[PDB]
Design a protein around this nucleic acid. Structure first.
Ligand code: NA
Ligand code: NA
Ligand code: NA
Ligand code: NA
Length: 329
DNA sequence: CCGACGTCGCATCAGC
DNA sequence: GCTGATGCGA
DNA sequence: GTCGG
């Protein structure tokens, strides 16, 4: 449907969502509003009343009431008021900086730090992650065209294979499903020498991050441990041409025996994962991001089943293998 | 009425 | 110093 | 805020 159908309603619900999360610190209310906005965004009809909307799963009495108010006046008194509140609007805004959550944002606003400029003047009060979030505030809010993602992938697959031709790397997320743009790059990494019961050699991930920094693809590090890296990268600039914006990239090292459950999971979509998990249970299986296990007649999960491919997972549950392209739900 | 609402790796805080 | 809790992002 | 046991 077109954003013009119920875009006013969905934007309203989404704005309310942020304030719940970033200001009132009510994560479940944040998710209730998003769920409502999502179900409405998918509704192929221009909503005429709150009652009509209440029929959708996730829209209850209160949101129905807010929709009625929005339809009759074109606005919502509570949202209008919070939008004008200097304190709340500032807290909400600061959370847009990666590394600054509801707590840090509240803390900053409390002591008078309300804008990016203010943050700029108070470096010593920002942890490492927050400094990077500030530094690339704008770049991080830009999406990544599929063409750039392909170029990013070329570099990641090439450097990884260069470190050890036995590594197996897979760029997941919506990009793997074929999306035209991405918000970041999610790379799942594995190596035959690493299994659930094998040595976790604290350098399989390090060696890959290192090479990527060596060829100057990775430019900054937000966090990095033995199994997960979260950083920033940037495609090499075309000589005599505008430089590419910095991008967020995460790299996860996963045991080989859990690699494919990981790829399926991190490929999504979220709606698809929910359905697949459902089908799995009714078929006597429990599927999480790590493994797939058989459920006994009493409900006791047995040992994880061997998975050597995504298809293996689909087979266990008697489901035809579906391309990432068709995993929208 | 009233609890659930995905979980977990990493960085950093809070307490001992 | 070490252990557990919290913040944060995904 | 919404759902549901
Ligand atoms: Na409803
Ligand atoms: Na943030
Ligand atoms: Na944010
Ligand atoms: Na080799």
């Amino acid at each position: 449907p077109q954003e013009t159908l119920n875009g006013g309603i969905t934007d309203m619900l989404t704005e309310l969502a942020n304030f719940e999360k970033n200001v009132s610190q009510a994560i479940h209310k944040y998710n209730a509003y998003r769920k409502a906005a999502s179900v409405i965004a998918k509704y192929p009809h221009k909503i005429k009343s709150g009652a009509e909307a209440k029929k959708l799963p996730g829209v209850g009495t209160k949101i129905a009431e807010k929709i009625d108010e929005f339809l009759a006046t074109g606005k919502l008194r509570k949202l209008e008021k919070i939008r004008q509140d200097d304190t709340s609007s500032s807290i909400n805004f600061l959370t847009r900086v990666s590394g600054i959550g509801p707590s840090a944002a509240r803390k900053f606003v409390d002591e008078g730090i309300k804008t990016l400029e203010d943050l700029r003047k108070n470096e010593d009060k920002l942890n490492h992650h927050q400094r990077i979030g500030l530094k690339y505030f704008g770049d991080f809010e830009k999406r990544i065209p599929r063409e750039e993602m392909l170029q990013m992938q070329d570099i990641v697959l090439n450097e990884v294979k260069k470190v050890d031709s036995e590594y197996i790397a897979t760029v997941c997320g919506s990009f793997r499903r074929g999306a035209e743009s991405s918000g970041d790059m999610d790379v799942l990494l594995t190596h035959p020498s690493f299994t659930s019961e094998s040595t976790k050699q604290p350098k399989l991930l390090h060696q890959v991050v290192e090479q990527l920094q060596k060829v100057h693809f990775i430019t900054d590090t937000l966090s990095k441990g033995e199994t997960k890296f979260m950083g920033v990268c940037q495609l090499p600039s075309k000589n005599d041409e505008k430089e590419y914006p910095h991008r967020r990239i995460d790299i996860r090292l996963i045991p080989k025996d859990q690699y494919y459950c990981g790829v399926l999971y991190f490929t999504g979509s979220d709606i698809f994962n929910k359905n697949m998990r459902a089908h799995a249970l009714e078929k006597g299986f429990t599927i999480n991001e790590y493994t797939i296990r058989p459920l006994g007649v009493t409900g006791v999960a047995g040992e994880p089943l061997p998975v050597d491919s995504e298809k293996d997972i689909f087979d266990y549950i008697q489901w035809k293998y579906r391309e990432p392209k068709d995993r929208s739900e």
